[PDB]
Amino acid sequence: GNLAGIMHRPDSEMAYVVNEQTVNIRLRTAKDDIVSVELLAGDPYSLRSLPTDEKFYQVPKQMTKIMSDGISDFWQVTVTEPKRRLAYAFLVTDMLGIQKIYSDKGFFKVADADLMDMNFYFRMPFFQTIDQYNAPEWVTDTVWYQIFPERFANGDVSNDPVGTKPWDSTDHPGREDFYGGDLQGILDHLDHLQELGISGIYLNPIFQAPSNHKYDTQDYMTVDPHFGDAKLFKQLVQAAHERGIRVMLDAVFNHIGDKSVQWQDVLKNEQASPYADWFHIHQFPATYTPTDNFEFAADATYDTFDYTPHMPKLNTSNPEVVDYLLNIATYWVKEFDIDAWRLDVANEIDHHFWRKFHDAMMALKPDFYILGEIWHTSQSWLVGDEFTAVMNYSYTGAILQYFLENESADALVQKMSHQLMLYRDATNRMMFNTVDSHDTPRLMTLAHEDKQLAKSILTFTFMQPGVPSIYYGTEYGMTGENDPDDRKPMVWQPELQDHDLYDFMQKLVQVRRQVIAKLSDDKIIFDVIGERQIRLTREDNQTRIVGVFNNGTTDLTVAQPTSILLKTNQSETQLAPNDFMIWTEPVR
């Protein structure tokens, strides 16, 4: 067999605690190289301490091949052990029938393995629930809706910025435009969110800042006055909660804006500023050479987000900065009862800080949801001690690549399988899936205004393990290239709304919340059934949901389902190119 392709990393996503007496264990092997895997496992001390002749290694446990990413196969098994201590090793057999034991000490013929020595084995030394990953149950039933507040609704002209433009959803907004959207406008349209069926709002930043996006924070402790005030924000959160809608705010903790009190003090006082060590200043005075692009300088003497001199990086290792940020994080939760924090550029802040942040948030609300913005592999933030999940851009990006280009279905399934096997099973359910956002081109533009294709992408994404989010306006087919063009004023004029797409998104949200979210500990299966034809199955012990997606250039015939939930062709058996059909069937 392919020994170099076999790996088990103890105390990781391959060996983790699910509850006080139960663990999940995974093994990686080379794809289709290993025919079977059994786990030998039990209490390490039992081997030599118990007087019985029975030994734990005499009764193997079968592992199941759960996924493949085209390179490796991934095997898993759940183990219960009342003594809450586990030693384990793997019996692996290849295609030619060659069997070896694989353990912490390496590979062995069975006859050569020192199975009576607890130290031969990999170890889960004591099952520690304090160290485990916990998924908040409420997220399961959530469909999110993301609001960029400057652009959702102007509920109050009296707080509008100077130079506010007329509300026109057909505009191509510039980087520094204002349209007057505010918190009163969100409050005014909660009925729309409830009618669409969403149950969580993700707001882009709302704290005082000079820009239309407010990632260049001036004051984290104040609602931007062009958006509202503390009383209005409290009213909004209470009104959302009364409708069953939770609220997630955007925490911009990697960097602060250059008009903050703290940075302005650095500019006045140089190294004598009480805030000098709140930043990463290489040379005083803190300077840069302006360029024709306000968001770029080549030579700032301080670290910044990207290369913008207006977003000096915060030194989150400084205890005073830690205290400042934790007090902000605590304030909005304690005083306004928000349900979650989305963490902007979360990967560029240290793990030490995020552990303290986690502990502080869980002390306030044990079911708090902590969502990191990270666009690459995020294993080290998703162990159970830092974030709940990340914005799952690598996953939705693979989906977009499949539907919009000509990849094989095999390639998509391989990428999604790779992603799922990076993380604990419960973590995968908490991932935040949005096909587009304020940082991407709009779905309907990527789809070249092919509504059927847009519906296929949305439906496929809504069937995935992660929780889905709808970027404002998706439900009416809003167009836009990347930022700033993805931030058009929300389309409230019915003549400009795609009503068929809105009806469809209502139905899709209902399939997600009433069917997909109510399966019990389901298994997901990706089957490639033909060229660019995928059958997605989610199933529990009584009910199976199946989605067939035909994204080739030919028609596809399927058996007539008894219980169709959602489809795009008028036929109950025929799928034309880019059609899909979702149905439900009992498990037999």
The tokens describing 557, both together, are 């015939």
Q: Are strands 432-434 and 467-471 parallel, antiparallel or unpaired?
A: parallel
Tell me how crowded residue 336 is: count the other CB atoms within 10 A of its CB: 16
Shortest Cβ 132–a copy of itself spacing (Å): 10
Shortest Cβ 549–a copy of itself spacing (Å): 22
Given 94, 156, 373, 386, the catalytic residue: 373
Cα angle value 557/562/566 (rounded, 5°)? 70
One of 1, 149, 180, 480 touching Ca ion (CB under 5 A): 180
Q: Are strands 246-251 and 200-203 parallel, antiparallel or unpaired?
A: parallel
Partner interacting with residue 51 (select from a copy of itself, Ca ion, none; CB below 5-8 Å by kind):
a copy of itself
The tokens describing 585, both together, are 């069937």
The tokens describing 537, both together, are 């199955």
Q: Would you call 344 a catalytic residue per the annotation?
A: yes
Any contact of residue 407 with a copy of itself (CB under 8 A)?
no
Any contact of residue 427 with Ca ion (CB under 5 A)?
no
Q: Are strands 61-62 and 99-103 parallel, antiparallel or unpaired?
A: unpaired
Shortest Cβ 118–a copy of itself spacing (Å): 8
One of 16, 56, 75, 122 touching a copy of itself (CB under 8 A): 122
Given 69, 344, 425, 475, the catalytic residue: 344
Any contact of residue 50 with a copy of itself (CB under 8 A)?
yes
d(CA 497, CA 478): 8
Collapsing DSSP states into helix, strand and coil, what is residue 532? coil
Any contact of residue 131 with a copy of itself (CB under 8 A)?
yes
Any contact of residue 172 with a copy of itself (CB under 8 A)?
no
Give one word for 345, left, alpha or beta, with left for phi > 0 and alpha for psi -120 to 50.
left
Q: What is the total count of residues that contact a copy of itself (CB under 8 A)?
A: 61
Any contact of residue 154 with Ca ion (CB under 5 A)?
yes
Tell me how crowded residue 566 is: count the other CB atoms within 10 A of its CB: 18
Shortest Cβ 473–Ca ion spacing (Å): 18
Q: Would you call 531 a catalytic residue per the annotation?
A: no
Shortest Cβ 159–Ca ion spacing (Å): 5
d(CA 121, CA 105): 7
Any contact of residue 182 with Ca ion (CB under 5 A)?
yes
- In the bound state with Ca ion, the residue whose beta carbon lies nearer, of 4 and 157, is 157
Please, which of residues 60-99 interact with a copy of itself by CB under 8 A? 71-72, 83-85
Partner interacting with residue 107 (select from a copy of itself, Ca ion, none; CB below 5-8 Å by kind):
a copy of itself
Q: Which residues pair with 335 in a beta bridge?
A: none
Structural element, H or E, at residue 320: helix 319-336
d(CA 160, CA 178): 8
Any contact of residue 157 with a copy of itself (CB under 8 A)?
no
Partner interacting with residue 38 (select from a copy of itself, Ca ion, none; CB below 5-8 Å by kind):
none
Give one word for 106, left, alpha or beta, with left for phi > 0 and alpha for psi -120 to 50.
left
Any contact of residue 11 with a copy of itself (CB under 8 A)?
yes
Collapsing DSSP states into helix, strand and coil, what is residue 130? helix
> What's the CA dihedral at 538, 540, 542, 543 to 10 degrees?
-20
d(CA 384, CA 124): 16
In the complex, the residues that contact a copy of itself under the rule CB under 8 A are 2-5, 7, 9-12, 29-31, 33, 45, 49-51, 71-72, 83-85, 104-107, 119, 121-123, 125-126, 128-131, 296, 298, 303, 306-307, 313, 317, 347-352, 355, 375-377, 379-380, 385, 393-394, 397, 415, 418
The catalytic residues are: 344, 373
In the complex, the residues that contact Ca ion under the rule CB under 5 A are 154, 156, 159-160, 180, 182
